[PDB]
Amino acid sequence: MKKLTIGLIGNPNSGKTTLFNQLTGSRQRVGNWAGVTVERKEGQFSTTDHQVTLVDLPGTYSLTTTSLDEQIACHYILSGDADLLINVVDASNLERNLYLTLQLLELGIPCIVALNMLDIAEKQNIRIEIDALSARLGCPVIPLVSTRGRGIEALKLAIDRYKANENVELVHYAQPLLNEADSLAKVMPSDIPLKQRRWLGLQMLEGDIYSRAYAGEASQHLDAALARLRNEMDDPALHIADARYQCIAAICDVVSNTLT
């Protein structure tokens, strides 16, 4: 029977392991990711409507390439096996944790954010405006309330309702970066979704070596693209990164408040 396949992804020590264990109970298996020694855990659970296979991805700060854990995560996410992702986000380290989230959203893969460590955040005098965050991300943000399994039940509701992320304005990259990324995208393997081709383009311009492997013929055009960009601006690779952090910072200014 065909399952609904969900990738579980987050930063190291984000609560992702405990969530995995809570969802799957005894219904889990362990092996290794193909060709490496890194453990691959997956398990099963059900919602009202769906039988789910949950694949636990290694903890990572980003999808950018350098730990195996990060390339494994990226490779799975680009493989297209998952129908959606649950992104476990530490509320007590929101700004840091959102770097990964933004990468997932830019790839356009359907996401649900599971917001964890709400107790820690409160104790650090931080309240998160959950709907304000969901609005800026374009995806559901579910608070993982521990009391009486409420968070888990809300997460399962969200799974039964999962949909494409909204086309919110996210990172606002300089137009030359977008132009060059799109020209690379045009050359890449046609069967790769356009969003992902464009993301790959930007990763290659940032200097991500692994992204080149996906990009087929595009990799031959990257030096010419970088030459143009270097003429147009100071440190194009840093402009890519700075756009991302600016975006995150602007979200967090609204969403994360003092509790006092």
Burial tier of 175 (Cβ tally within 10 Å: 0-12, 13-18, 19+): exposed
Distance of alpha carbon 183 from alpha carbon 165, whole angstroms: 25
Give the closest residue to 146 by CA, choosing from 19, 57, 6, 24: 19
118 annotated ligand binder: yes
Is residue 233 annotated as involved in ligand binding?
A: no
176 is in an annotated binding site: no
> 205 labelled as ligand-binding?
no
Is 206 among the annotated ligand-binding positions?
A: no
User: Which amino acid, one-letter code, is at 67?
Assistant: S
Q: Is 41 annotated as a binding residue?
A: no
11 is in an annotated binding site: yes
Q: Is 32 annotated as a binding residue?
A: no
Report the DSSP beta bridge partners of residue 126: 258
117 is annotated as contributing to ligand binding: yes
Annotated binding residue at 151?
A: no
The answer on whether 145 is annotated among ligand-binding residues is yes
Is 110 annotated in a binding site? The answer is no
Is 125 annotated to bind ligand? no
Q: Is 138 annotated as a binding residue?
A: no
231 marked as part of a ligand binding site: no
Tokens 């949909």 — which residue?
Answer: 163
- Rounded to the nearest 5 percent, the helix, strand and coil shares of the chain are 50, 20, 30
Residue 13 annotated as part of some ligand binding site: yes
Structure tokens at 174: 């300089």
**57 annotated among ligand-binding-site residues:** yes
Backbone angles phi, psi at 49, to 5 degrees: -105, -25
Q: Is 17 annotated as a binding residue?
A: yes
| Binding-site annotation: residue ranges for GTP | 10-17, 35-39, 56-59, 116-119, 145-147
| Binding-site annotation: residue ranges | 10-17, 35-39, 56-59, 116-119, 145-147
